[PDB]
Amino acid sequence: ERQRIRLLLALLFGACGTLAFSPYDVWPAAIISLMGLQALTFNRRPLQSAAIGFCWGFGLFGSGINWVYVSIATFGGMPGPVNIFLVVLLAAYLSLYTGLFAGVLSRLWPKTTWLRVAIAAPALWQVTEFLRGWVLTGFPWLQFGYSQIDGPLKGLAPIMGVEAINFLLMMVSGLLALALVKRNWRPLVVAVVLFALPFPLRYIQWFTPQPEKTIQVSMVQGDIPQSLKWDEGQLLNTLKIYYNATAPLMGKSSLIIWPESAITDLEINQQPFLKALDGELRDKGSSLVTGIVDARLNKQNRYDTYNTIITLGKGAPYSYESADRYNKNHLVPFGEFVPLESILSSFSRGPYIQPPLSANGIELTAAICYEIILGEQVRDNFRPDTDYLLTISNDAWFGKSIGPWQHFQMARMRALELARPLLRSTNNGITAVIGPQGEIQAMIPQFTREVLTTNVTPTTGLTPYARTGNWPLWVLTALFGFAAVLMS
Ligand SMILES: CCCCCCCCCCCCO[C@@H]1O[C@H](CO)[C@@H](O[C@H]2O[C@H](CO)[C@@H](O)[C@H](O)[C@H]2O)[C@H](O)[C@H]1O
């Protein structure tokens, strides 16, 4: 048991946690990876244990974030070998937080007691992962709470959020890392009863369906090549693609959805098309919701370029100044704007709170692409009278990789936390309809030009996570943190 070998063990145990997420959905690999990280940091100095946490997260992020390489294969045009260093530094920067959790736990709790692994680690894991999702803009990717979307602890999610499952998974795997090292038989069962108490919670229908307001919703997946997506011209076909695919559905569907940045043009430059399209949807009796880029003039006669969603048709008449839209708030850290003080067009940030959308008597809370993984921001924009959850994205990058599935698995948790049907539309990613409990009602394969049409029923409940948020976990994190820190 030297310092050299424990680095390679955490490197592989970190890669074990990758299997916990989609498409693998091996949720025990989360507990196994949590046990491998929590046990390898026993009776060590902080500076040598931080190397284990740095090598553990580097195995986790090095296996679950490697799909960002093909993201640069389309944007940027780099020679190749430089993109690989970015993934390492991206994993290194994210591993600094994993190493920050391993170093602090070794300074205050060098003793291998149940207090460290069942009280301190679940609370410190909350503050560590939160800082990794707060510094700069935030990147809370690969949280083992999302692995329980198809697992046992899914009943605990609508009560205290996805981050609270990270708390209990660390709390269970902590007592599981105890009984595996100390060979004691008590915390093994104490881990299970704390793991078994949230199991009877996955049969509680917090919501209530409204079968009368059942509608037929259609969502279009145009499958536009990313190499020709933003190309000048060619968009005459893209509009002809959607319209020839949307027109036969305008008469009978009550709501039609197009993905993010579907119309590759400024909103002001395609006005004669939308005024003609809106007037046709009203005759048929349907509502259309699509995403488009907006270069809007501010009061200072300067343009703020936004990533926007607009509404058309019956129940939502079109207008360039209409309040029935949604601007992107949480921007991509480097795909749109620059976060640093200075360098060495930029997208503008929208409001943090926006009223839900409207379309033929339907209330929809929106979230563009990356914004769906922010459970607290989705909860804040959420309103009681909301009929469905809505999310549109463009996963053209990360092609043929495991990226979109990890992204897709996190979006299902938002429907479970809020008990609302989640409608998701993408360019070539996982386009599906998710029920109020993370169940996949319908889904179509990737890399295809198809249209998804199904029936949905709204809900009108209020989950404990919708009333409260992640603060009940912070209280449990505070009490677990305030009590365990004082002892040292
Ligand atoms: C053939 C279907 C199975 C594909 C298997 C991919 C490997 C299994 C998953 C390992 C983790 C993700 O693995 C990732 O997969 C992508 C996508 O194919 C591959 O990526 C590589 O091939 C793809 C084409 O598919 C290129 O566009 C990309 O620039 C290149 O890096 C690499 O292998 C790895 O970056």
Numbering used by the authors: 8 to 351, 363 to 506
Paper excerpt:
In the case of Lnt, the nitrilase domain catalyzes the attachment of a fatty acid derived from a phospholipid to the alpha-amino group of the N-terminal cysteine of the apolipoprotein creating the final mature lipoprotein.
Construct 1 (Lnt-C1) contains a fifteen-amino acid C-terminal tail that contains the His8-tag used for purification. It crystallized in space group P212121 using the vapor-diffusion method and contains two molecules in the asymmetric unit. In one of those molecules (chain B) clear electron density can be seen extending off the active site C387 side chain that is not seen in the other molecule, even at lower map contour levels. We interpret this extra density as the thioester acyl-intermediate based on mass spectrometry analysis on purified Lnt that identified a palmitoyl modification at position C387. Although mass spectrometry identified a C20-palmitoyl; we could only confidently build half of the lipid tail into electron density where the membrane region is expected to be. The positioning of this arm in chain B is made possible by an adjacent chain A protomer that makes crystal contacts with F357 and F358 that pin the arm in this upward position. As aptly named by Lu et al. this arm could be acting as a protective lid to the otherwise highly open active site when in this upward position sheltering this reactive intermediate state from the surrounding environment and deacylation. Although likely due to crystal lattice contacts, the two molecules are arranged within the asymmetric unit in such a way that might give insights into one possible mode of apolipoprotein docking to Lnt. The C-terminus of chain B is in close proximity to the essential W237 at the entry of the substrate portal of chain A (zoomed box Fig. 5A).
